[PDB]
């Protein structure tokens, strides 16, 4: 399969710098032209850098440029992206794509991202919080307090997933929190517990907390 | 810099209709000795990185259905989807892949039309557990209502909270067509001890009265 795998991000201080790579397999890599793109938290797409299949030629818009330098090792199969100088806009998810040959050109073959996020604040485990009420009954699970991103939050191991709302994770005051919901029957709960099973990577945190009516 | 603006920003669809999804460039996107437009579009499924969709303005990519038809030169192109289904749910991107900088349109989102749904709404009092650390947070939500417009007040003790709020909406649900979305009300323990009755309501266009949810201590 032609696959592009990106690895690196992480949060980095401002004005600091981090070194991202992709790796490439299933295709003669020096025989093309290979970008890096970001989406940004408001899933806007901006174009980060262009190399030629060389290494000879480069470029960049003006946000990065002077910042940010792309390199090819072409006998290792791989793309690297330094960038220095990090400002709170360059957080994102970043990817690395294939200029298409044919002159078909464009990003290909994209892969699943590496998240970078700059900022001042510093990693902050979850408070996982049961929301129990005082056909059927809505349970909750609030997670509020961690940084970076992500958390992974799943009901009963992953048995439960219909009737199961996660809200996207929102950033206040430089911490983000994260709800979810799950409606079962009444029968289902309090009888069968509920957990939810939050995972907090940065912070090495597992929680695995049951819905208690007290 | 190329400007790329796409139109709409969000589009209602029936399965089953012929959808157009415009994308002006400010600058011709035409080669003249190429003979070709340097459009590519890019569609970008929930949780996934966009896919090549068509280049050329017109030409497609492998394993693209027929029913996507790209159109145009110069500066206006189409996207046009014969008869849309639920699997064609995405942002859709419009791309300058003529001169640098390389630039992107805005994209072009498409939800699936279905019939309104009032919201289901739960109010939750702070844990105990979270009493602890000096905070108290209310959580309200409001499930699986459509059309998405919705308007969410706090009330404490009758009068109206707007600060500590923090609001987060889920996508379209891909089961059922519906939206949801989390309202959360953060205090300290200490206002929250001193009143007795806390009020999520909300406006939705399913309801002339306001759906209201409300404790009491």
């Known amino acids: 399969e032609v696959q592009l795998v990106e690895s690196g991000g992480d949060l980095v201080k401002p004005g600091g710098s981090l070194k991202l790579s992709c790796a490439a397999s299933?295709?003669?890599?020096?025989?093309?032209?290979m970008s890096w793109v970001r989406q940004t938290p408001d899933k806007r797409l901006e174009w980060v850098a262009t190399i030629s299949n060389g290494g000879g030629y480069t470029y960049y818009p003006d946000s990065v440029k002077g910042r940010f330098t792309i390199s090819r090792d072409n006998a290792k199969n791989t793309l690297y992206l330094q960038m220095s100088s990090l400002k709170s806009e360059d957080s994102a998810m970043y990817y690395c794509?294939?200029?298409?040959?044919?002159?078909?050109?464009?990003?290909?073959?994209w892969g699943q991202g590496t998240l970078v996020t700059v900022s001042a604040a510093k990693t902050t485990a979850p408070s996982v919080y049961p929301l129990a009420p005082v056909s059927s009954v809505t349970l909750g699970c609030l997670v509020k307090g961690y940084f970076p991103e992500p958390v992974t939050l799943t009901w009963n191991s992953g048995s439960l997933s219909s009737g199961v709302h996660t809200f996207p994770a929102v950033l206040q005051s430089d911490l983000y929190t994260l709800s979810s919901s799950v409606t079962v029957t009444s029968s289902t709960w309090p009888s069968q517990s509920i957990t939810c099973n939050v995972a907090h990577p940065a912070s090495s945190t597992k929680v695995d907390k049951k819905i208690e009516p007290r | 810099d190329i400007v790329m603006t796409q139109s709409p920003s969000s589009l209602t669809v029936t399965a089953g209709e012929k959808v157009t999804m415009s994308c002006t460039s400010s600058?011709?996107?035409?080669?003249?000795?190429?003979?070709?437009?340097?459009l590519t579009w890019y569609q970008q499924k929930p949780g996934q990185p966009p896919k090549v969709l068509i280049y050329?303005?017109?030409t497609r990519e492998s394993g693209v259905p027929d029913r996507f038809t790209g159109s145009g030169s110069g500066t206006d192109f189409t996207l046009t989807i014969s008869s849309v289904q639920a699997e064609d749910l995405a942002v859709y991107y419009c791309?300058?892949?003529?001169?640098?900088?390389?630039?992107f349109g805005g994209g072009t989102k498409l939800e699936l039309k279905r019939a309104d749904a009032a919201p289901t709404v739960s109010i939750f009092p702070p844990s105990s557990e979270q009493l602890t650390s000096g905070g108290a947070s209310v959580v309200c939500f409001l499930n699986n209502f459509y059309p998405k417009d919705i308007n969410v007040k706090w009330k404490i003790d009758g009068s109206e909270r707007q600060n500590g709020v923090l609001n987060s909406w889920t996508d379209q649900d891909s089961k059922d067509s519906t939206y949801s979305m989390s309202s959360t009300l953060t205090l300290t323990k200490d206002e929250y001890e001193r009143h007795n009755s806390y009020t999520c309501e909300a406006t939705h266009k399913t309801s002339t009265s306001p759906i209201v949810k409300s404790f009491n201590r």
């Open positions: 050329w303005a017109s």
């Open positions: 794509a294939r200029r298409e040959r044919y002159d078909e050109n464009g990003f290909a073959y």
């Open positions: 791309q300058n892949d003529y001169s640098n900088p390389l630039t």
């Open positions: 299933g295709f003669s890599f020096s025989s093309y032209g």
């Open positions: 600058q011709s996107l035409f080669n003249s000795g190429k003979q070709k437009n340097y």
